């Protein structure tokens, strides 16, 4: 019951775009949009527009050159079965997502009757498979260009050239180098007399430095012959997505966890330092020390918070790779999670650190005025120097929190646009054949340079305490 | 573990807690080593500001403990190392004994000995140039030149005292770490303990800021 | 010397409430673990409660868990055992017992007189012998067979031997099966190995008649034997 | 008036006598012995309870319970096996410079820088420890209290005298006074018959416990001597000095037997002691390390360098199971 | 001068002691030190079986 009465004409084109027609009759009934064989060819080369992303293209090809170029049997046009339709509806919804399936391809019981010979089985589509520059041949439903079938985005960011990558490599190199050297210098200064210098505030400052140093060496895990490929690029040749996968290597998940732990530990160490200073300066003179009693509990606290945050990351993890920066880090795929997980700790730390630092400076200001014993010029000089100095250090901290926050929000909005811009680009790259193509907006790379400057500036800020 | 060893560990932790608490309580006090040559004036200031004789007092919410070792006859170098980590060294010096017998030179020798001693490189020195009341009139007849050959100036207390103070404060070889404070004990006040408090709070503040990673 | 005396005894209605006050006088009470042990009118001893030095740890027996409460007051030097909802199996004499746990110590040394309170998986130290008569002048061995090998990795064998005299508080005789209890004559000698213990009383005289309880101390609850009473 | 010349005549006579019968050259005999090679030791346990410098250690006869002094004024009796504490005795005179331990293991004898060897009582009923007696009478400062029995204590004071006391009577039953300088160290004998005093006159003397008259007077040092310890045989003893030259003297021959010296060391010796066998000598230097010397060849054997400050006291057990060094880091380490 | 009198008395009392040739002294020292080479847990480190540390 898969046969209609329609007058058809002998073929003029003897191809299924790669496969020879095994027949000598072709109708234009199934093609609801097409009228003539010329328009049939027009719609054939239109749907040839699906040339890229072959995993659905190779299996739609039967349906393509079956509806447009069918087979007549004595004024009796053939209609395909349910199997050929349903093979190209669910996973091959590119036509639906972009242009919508027209009335002719919506397989309805009159259009596509059930349980009869397809006849297209003999037309084998083996000569198929293409991925353009922004695409790569993959066979992983986990890692594909989810919106589009067949291929997946490569490892190297397609929004730039290797010139910009070299520029960023040089940038991270310079900053990583200077911070590493300065932090090793302060490390050496504290460790050279480590057997003596066990006084706790200085030890806390040492631990801040140590954390930022391991952060530096984390960031400097590239520039090797085969570093970026093993870190951020996958086996298939796709960028890292949904890090970490339980399938492939755990190469960059560790370079992520160390740098994230480094920074979070460093910042929480810093706020603990500020608290320790406030509580000390409260009892400046009178040889009473609050900090010494409870040291163990606060030391435990500082270490745990980054670890519980990073496991809370790894629980539902959208961490992934980056070719422009050259590190697997969190939330490049999804703005919201990174936004929350960067903003919330930094907001907390600014609000509490600022407060404790202001209470500390207000205390050690008032001690100059109201101390019963007349403070000698030698003590007043040092307490005024430290007051001014803590004021400047607090000012720099505030500056770094502002610049990072502003840059983050800018990135969130621009990424929200870049997603759609890139989708329009890859659509254009698919449309180049039908009848290169301008990129609307790009990542302004100087703003990520600003972000890196902010990170390493914070890194260098915690080393002014040995520059006496 | 076992049954009663579990209790043994409880006892261990409990007395460790008591020891930490007692240590914390004791460490909040400040200790002042009180030197002085024989008959310099050590017996005056001990009472005025109120083997080994541990004598403690309290002024403006601080627990001061004076250890006077002057009443012991032994080699100084043998027991002096015991007093490392003491806050201040009250070094009383007889001023009136400039002429009595050389005593000034003996006090000067002891000061030079204990000031540059290997153990006390870090600690500050408070010295009370005492018995000024009898000294002021002693130079009307007997000039200072009898004790000091290389002095040339006026025989006025205001100058003589200042020169002797300068002469004593010159001895310290390490000028950049340990401060030297000076006072002339006055009978009518409680200002002596006030001076001690001021010097001790100064050195405590300096030490606390050094411990605070800023200095 | 040490003066343990207890009060708050008498008779209580079943399902009632009572507190027992063990007042310690004449030693540093703030550093001593205190045991509560009872004795039925005509049966052997049984463990009730333990409190450690400084209220750090508490232990109760399976029979009286959740019902009884034990507390100590250091500045007044008092031990309170409050019991509620009394059963017919609690009519007994009650002793508060000193203990101090450090290396080469002698726990369960001094036993208080005690009070009469009446109403209207673990180790079983099965003391084999129940009754045996003796004549003065002879030496006699008394053995009690353990249900579990007490010898620990440390090398010690946690077993104590207590003597009770007719109408008296039972006093410590041997501690850790080897070392003599302080202020005890050199006649008594404890010996044995894992799962085999014996106290030999040499040249037995008067002022030694009474009952002998062997008590394990390996895990908690601690359990006394049936005991052996040496008849005159 | 001139009898000092006759004294110095006898001094030269005794020097000529002791030298004329000295074909020792001890080293020229030890060449046949096979060397100990190199012995290394690891910190088996660390005992950390103090809040200041510690000044003294003493192993009990049990070879388990060591008593340790302190500077806060809290002598704590350690348990060397499980790192447990048993007693924290808070002494009155916060200045301490020595500790002893009874051969029975009952009494702990302390006393520092205020002329009172105060003996305590551990194995008592009624719980806590108590100050049994405060032995006073010395004019200088107590240097080393040591027990003979549970009743007799010998104390090296700082006033050039050594006192044998009687605890029951609490008075100096016997006094020994031959020294000119501060008597800084005392060491008893295995047979407990005659002890050796190390004084600040750069001269070690052999006393008699029973009689009271000195029998041997060994000189040869340039500086103060800070520790003595008998050869377990009881016929020789080591002497550590401020000249960094530990030397073994013979009680029978009546002169120095051999010298120990290494060129690059300029520090002072604090404590010396022998292992149970008496082959190697433990010596505590001011280089924040203790040196294990071969006491038969003078060749350095081992360096236990695991302290941030100088080692003030060094105890070897009476069964040779471990050594315990007490530094100024407020820790004391048990090496093996 | 009684100090000097006591000193010369002690020197006279100490002068007359029967010395021993070091030949035998060092021999006795070596003999004792060698005979007790087995019962020294520091020279030959006993295996971790008996050593309670
Ligand atoms: C902290 N400063 C940000 C600035 C924005 C930077 N950034 C966002 C990003 C990173 C990593 C992955 C993705 C992504 C993954 C899957 N589908 C779409 C996008 C987006 C990109 O430069 C872009 S936009 C884009 C669109 C398509 C494919 C790649 C791709 C890449 Cl790369 C990162 C650093
Ligand atoms: C003490 C105060 C100032 C701490 C300052 C917080 C700064 C230094 C920390 C907190 C969060 C961190 C940022 C979070 C993640 C990214 C995105 C990455 O693509 C570049 C680095 C960058 C931008 C990090 C740099 C360092 C950073 C900005």
mmCIF file of N, CA and C in Angstrom, chain D residues 90-159:
data_model
loop_
_atom_site.group_PDB
_atom_site.id
_atom_site.type_symbol
_atom_site.label_atom_id
_atom_site.label_comp_id
_atom_site.label_asym_id
_atom_site.label_seq_id
_atom_site.Cartn_x
_atom_site.Cartn_y
_atom_site.Cartn_z
ATOM 1 N N UNK D 90 55.444 20.110 90.268
ATOM 2 C CA UNK D 90 55.725 21.544 90.215
ATOM 3 C C UNK D 90 56.600 21.995 91.393
ATOM 4 N N UNK D 91 57.906 22.131 91.152
ATOM 5 C CA UNK D 91 58.897 22.537 92.190
ATOM 6 C C UNK D 91 58.815 24.051 92.412
ATOM 7 N N UNK D 92 59.182 24.501 93.618
ATOM 8 C CA UNK D 92 59.031 25.909 94.080
ATOM 9 C C UNK D 92 60.067 26.798 93.383
ATOM 10 N N UNK D 93 61.354 26.560 93.653
ATOM 11 C CA UNK D 93 62.491 27.350 93.109
ATOM 12 C C UNK D 93 62.634 27.066 91.609
ATOM 13 N N UNK D 94 62.023 27.912 90.770
ATOM 14 C CA UNK D 94 61.835 27.712 89.303
ATOM 15 C C UNK D 94 63.167 27.461 88.576
ATOM 16 N N UNK D 95 64.309 27.776 89.199
ATOM 17 C CA UNK D 95 65.671 27.531 88.647
ATOM 18 C C UNK D 95 66.150 26.133 89.051
ATOM 19 N N UNK D 96 66.344 25.260 88.057
ATOM 20 C CA UNK D 96 66.789 23.842 88.212
ATOM 21 C C UNK D 96 68.074 23.658 87.396
ATOM 22 N N UNK D 97 68.991 22.810 87.871
ATOM 23 C CA UNK D 97 70.277 22.507 87.177
ATOM 24 C C UNK D 97 70.695 21.034 87.321
ATOM 25 N N UNK D 98 69.853 20.167 87.896
ATOM 26 C CA UNK D 98 70.150 18.718 88.075
ATOM 27 C C UNK D 98 68.886 17.951 88.473
ATOM 28 N N UNK D 99 68.889 16.643 88.209
ATOM 29 C CA UNK D 99 67.876 15.668 88.688
ATOM 30 C C UNK D 99 68.538 14.310 88.936
ATOM 31 N N UNK D 100 68.067 13.602 89.963
ATOM 32 C CA UNK D 100 68.461 12.215 90.301
ATOM 33 C C UNK D 100 67.214 11.331 90.317
ATOM 34 N N UNK D 101 67.419 10.019 90.438
ATOM 35 C CA UNK D 101 66.347 8.996 90.516
ATOM 36 C C UNK D 101 66.850 7.813 91.347
ATOM 37 N N UNK D 102 66.078 7.423 92.366
ATOM 38 C CA UNK D 102 66.449 6.391 93.365
ATOM 39 C C UNK D 102 66.634 5.039 92.681
ATOM 40 N N UNK D 103 67.705 4.274 93.012
ATOM 41 C CA UNK D 103 67.898 2.931 92.459
ATOM 42 C C UNK D 103 66.719 1.972 92.700
ATOM 43 N N UNK D 104 65.988 2.157 93.805
ATOM 44 C CA UNK D 104 64.713 1.452 94.111
ATOM 45 C C UNK D 104 63.585 1.990 93.219
ATOM 46 N N UNK D 105 63.622 3.289 92.900
ATOM 47 C CA UNK D 105 62.660 3.977 92.013
ATOM 48 C C UNK D 105 61.530 4.632 92.790
ATOM 49 N N UNK D 106 61.801 5.057 94.031
ATOM 50 C CA UNK D 106 60.824 5.708 94.944
ATOM 51 C C UNK D 106 60.988 7.228 94.867
ATOM 52 N N UNK D 107 62.148 7.742 95.281
ATOM 53 C CA UNK D 107 62.397 9.194 95.489
ATOM 54 C C UNK D 107 63.026 9.813 94.235
ATOM 55 N N UNK D 108 62.582 11.030 93.901
ATOM 56 C CA UNK D 108 63.182 11.927 92.868
ATOM 57 C C UNK D 108 63.851 13.087 93.607
ATOM 58 N N UNK D 109 65.166 13.252 93.428
ATOM 59 C CA UNK D 109 65.977 14.325 94.050
ATOM 60 C C UNK D 109 66.269 15.412 93.012
ATOM 61 N N UNK D 110 65.679 16.594 93.210
ATOM 62 C CA UNK D 110 65.881 17.817 92.387
ATOM 63 C C UNK D 110 66.636 18.861 93.219
ATOM 64 N N UNK D 111 66.759 20.090 92.706
ATOM 65 C CA UNK D 111 67.408 21.229 93.390
ATOM 66 C C UNK D 111 68.399 21.929 92.479
ATOM 67 N N UNK D 112 68.196 23.228 92.230
ATOM 68 C CA UNK D 112 68.924 24.003 91.204
ATOM 69 C C UNK D 112 69.800 25.095 91.791
ATOM 70 N N UNK D 113 69.379 26.358 91.644
ATOM 71 C CA UNK D 113 70.250 27.560 91.775
ATOM 72 C C UNK D 113 69.970 28.320 93.083
ATOM 73 N N UNK D 114 69.420 27.663 94.114
ATOM 74 C CA UNK D 114 69.129 28.316 95.422
ATOM 75 C C UNK D 114 69.474 27.392 96.599
ATOM 76 N N UNK D 115 70.482 26.529 96.437
ATOM 77 C CA UNK D 115 71.190 25.833 97.547
ATOM 78 C C UNK D 115 70.235 24.929 98.342
ATOM 79 N N UNK D 116 69.272 24.285 97.673
ATOM 80 C CA UNK D 116 68.303 23.350 98.321
ATOM 81 C C UNK D 116 68.098 22.128 97.418
ATOM 82 N N UNK D 117 68.781 21.019 97.722
ATOM 83 C CA UNK D 117 68.477 19.690 97.126
ATOM 84 C C UNK D 117 67.203 19.167 97.803
ATOM 85 N N UNK D 118 66.052 19.411 97.166
ATOM 86 C CA UNK D 118 64.698 19.059 97.668
ATOM 87 C C UNK D 118 64.301 17.686 97.118
ATOM 88 N N UNK D 119 64.256 16.666 97.982
ATOM 89 C CA UNK D 119 63.896 15.270 97.591
ATOM 90 C C UNK D 119 62.369 15.137 97.668
ATOM 91 N N UNK D 120 61.780 14.418 96.709
ATOM 92 C CA UNK D 120 60.318 14.171 96.593
ATOM 93 C C UNK D 120 60.021 12.699 96.899
ATOM 94 N N UNK D 121 58.730 12.360 96.978
ATOM 95 C CA UNK D 121 58.220 10.998 97.286
ATOM 96 C C UNK D 121 57.141 10.641 96.255
ATOM 97 N N UNK D 122 57.403 9.642 95.402
ATOM 98 C CA UNK D 122 56.471 9.196 94.327
ATOM 99 C C UNK D 122 55.549 8.098 94.863
ATOM 100 N N UNK D 123 56.120 6.957 95.265
ATOM 101 C CA UNK D 123 55.361 5.755 95.706
ATOM 102 C C UNK D 123 54.825 6.006 97.118
ATOM 103 N N UNK D 124 53.786 6.841 97.199
ATOM 104 C CA UNK D 124 53.035 7.191 98.432
ATOM 105 C C UNK D 124 51.544 6.954 98.177
ATOM 106 N N UNK D 125 50.810 6.556 99.220
ATOM 107 C CA UNK D 125 49.324 6.595 99.250
ATOM 108 C C UNK D 125 48.896 8.060 99.400
ATOM 109 N N UNK D 126 47.588 8.327 99.333
ATOM 110 C CA UNK D 126 46.985 9.690 99.393
ATOM 111 C C UNK D 126 47.294 10.462 98.097
ATOM 112 N N UNK D 127 47.545 9.752 96.988
ATOM 113 C CA UNK D 127 47.599 10.312 95.622
ATOM 114 C C UNK D 127 48.886 11.059 95.324
ATOM 115 N N UNK D 128 48.825 12.396 95.341
ATOM 116 C CA UNK D 128 49.847 13.311 94.755
ATOM 117 C C UNK D 128 51.202 13.143 95.451
ATOM 118 N N UNK D 129 52.263 13.612 94.789
ATOM 119 C CA UNK D 129 53.656 13.663 95.330
ATOM 120 C C UNK D 129 53.725 14.751 96.409
ATOM 121 N N UNK D 130 54.755 14.692 97.258
ATOM 122 C CA UNK D 130 55.002 15.663 98.359
ATOM 123 C C UNK D 130 56.507 15.923 98.491
ATOM 124 N N UNK D 131 56.880 17.154 98.852
ATOM 125 C CA UNK D 131 58.275 17.539 99.224
ATOM 126 C C UNK D 131 58.587 16.869 100.567
ATOM 127 N N UNK D 132 59.384 15.796 100.553
ATOM 128 C CA UNK D 132 59.728 14.992 101.756
ATOM 129 C C UNK D 132 60.664 15.804 102.657
ATOM 130 N N UNK D 133 61.813 16.220 102.114
ATOM 131 C CA UNK D 133 62.828 17.060 102.809
ATOM 132 C C UNK D 133 63.478 18.030 101.817
ATOM 133 N N UNK D 134 63.903 19.194 102.321
ATOM 134 C CA UNK D 134 64.703 20.212 101.586
ATOM 135 C C UNK D 134 66.099 20.288 102.215
ATOM 136 N N UNK D 135 67.054 19.511 101.689
ATOM 137 C CA UNK D 135 68.465 19.499 102.174
ATOM 138 C C UNK D 135 69.117 20.842 101.824
ATOM 139 N N UNK D 136 69.372 21.669 102.846
ATOM 140 C CA UNK D 136 70.004 23.009 102.757
ATOM 141 C C UNK D 136 71.236 23.063 103.666
ATOM 142 N N UNK D 137 72.172 23.968 103.358
ATOM 143 C CA UNK D 137 73.469 24.094 104.055
ATOM 144 C C UNK D 137 74.577 24.606 103.149
ATOM 145 N N UNK D 138 74.499 24.326 101.843
ATOM 146 C CA UNK D 138 75.459 24.813 100.812
ATOM 147 C C UNK D 138 75.371 26.338 100.681
ATOM 148 N N UNK D 139 76.489 26.966 100.303
ATOM 149 C CA UNK D 139 76.678 28.443 100.229
ATOM 150 C C UNK D 139 76.746 28.919 98.769
ATOM 151 N N UNK D 140 77.077 28.030 97.823
ATOM 152 C CA UNK D 140 77.230 28.347 96.387
ATOM 153 C C UNK D 140 75.938 28.123 95.617
ATOM 154 N N UNK D 141 75.872 27.038 94.840
ATOM 155 C CA UNK D 141 74.662 26.573 94.106
ATOM 156 C C UNK D 141 74.802 25.080 93.776
ATOM 157 N N UNK D 142 73.734 24.300 93.979
ATOM 158 C CA UNK D 142 73.719 22.828 93.731
ATOM 159 C C UNK D 142 73.977 22.553 92.245
ATOM 160 N N UNK D 143 74.947 21.679 91.955
ATOM 161 C CA UNK D 143 75.432 21.343 90.589
ATOM 162 C C UNK D 143 74.956 19.945 90.176
ATOM 163 N N UNK D 144 75.121 18.944 91.050
ATOM 164 C CA UNK D 144 74.718 17.531 90.797
ATOM 165 C C UNK D 144 74.376 16.812 92.107
ATOM 166 N N UNK D 145 73.086 16.532 92.315
ATOM 167 C CA UNK D 145 72.549 15.606 93.350
ATOM 168 C C UNK D 145 72.535 14.187 92.765
ATOM 169 N N UNK D 146 73.073 13.199 93.492
ATOM 170 C CA UNK D 146 73.068 11.761 93.085
ATOM 171 C C UNK D 146 72.761 10.876 94.297
ATOM 172 N N UNK D 147 71.895 9.875 94.107
ATOM 173 C CA UNK D 147 71.472 8.906 95.153
ATOM 174 C C UNK D 147 72.422 7.704 95.176
ATOM 175 N N UNK D 148 72.746 7.243 96.389
ATOM 176 C CA UNK D 148 73.463 5.966 96.657
ATOM 177 C C UNK D 148 72.423 4.895 96.999
ATOM 178 N N UNK D 149 71.656 5.134 98.066
ATOM 179 C CA UNK D 149 70.512 4.294 98.518
ATOM 180 C C UNK D 149 69.251 5.171 98.541
ATOM 181 N N UNK D 150 68.183 4.705 99.199
ATOM 182 C CA UNK D 150 66.940 5.486 99.452
ATOM 183 C C UNK D 150 67.130 6.448 100.637
ATOM 184 N N UNK D 151 68.291 6.429 101.304
ATOM 185 C CA UNK D 151 68.560 7.216 102.542
ATOM 186 C C UNK D 151 69.760 8.166 102.377
ATOM 187 N N UNK D 152 70.740 7.839 101.523
ATOM 188 C CA UNK D 152 72.013 8.604 101.390
ATOM 189 C C UNK D 152 72.092 9.253 100.003
ATOM 190 N N UNK D 153 72.239 10.581 99.981
ATOM 191 C CA UNK D 153 72.433 11.413 98.755
ATOM 192 C C UNK D 153 73.799 12.100 98.858
ATOM 193 N N UNK D 154 74.526 12.139 97.737
ATOM 194 C CA UNK D 154 75.795 12.913 97.581
ATOM 195 C C UNK D 154 75.509 14.063 96.614
ATOM 196 N N UNK D 155 75.890 15.285 96.998
ATOM 197 C CA UNK D 155 75.609 16.522 96.223
ATOM 198 C C UNK D 155 76.923 17.261 95.957
ATOM 199 N N UNK D 156 77.238 17.462 94.675
ATOM 200 C CA UNK D 156 78.269 18.410 94.186
ATOM 201 C C UNK D 156 77.658 19.814 94.170
ATOM 202 N N UNK D 157 78.105 20.678 95.083
ATOM 203 C CA UNK D 157 77.676 22.096 95.201
ATOM 204 C C UNK D 157 78.585 22.986 94.344
ATOM 205 N N UNK D 158 78.340 24.299 94.366
ATOM 206 C CA UNK D 158 79.084 25.309 93.589
ATOM 207 C C UNK D 158 80.108 26.056 94.429
ATOM 208 N N UNK D 159 80.233 25.719 95.721
ATOM 209 C CA UNK D 159 81.118 26.424 96.693
ATOM 210 C C UNK D 159 82.377 25.588 96.982
#
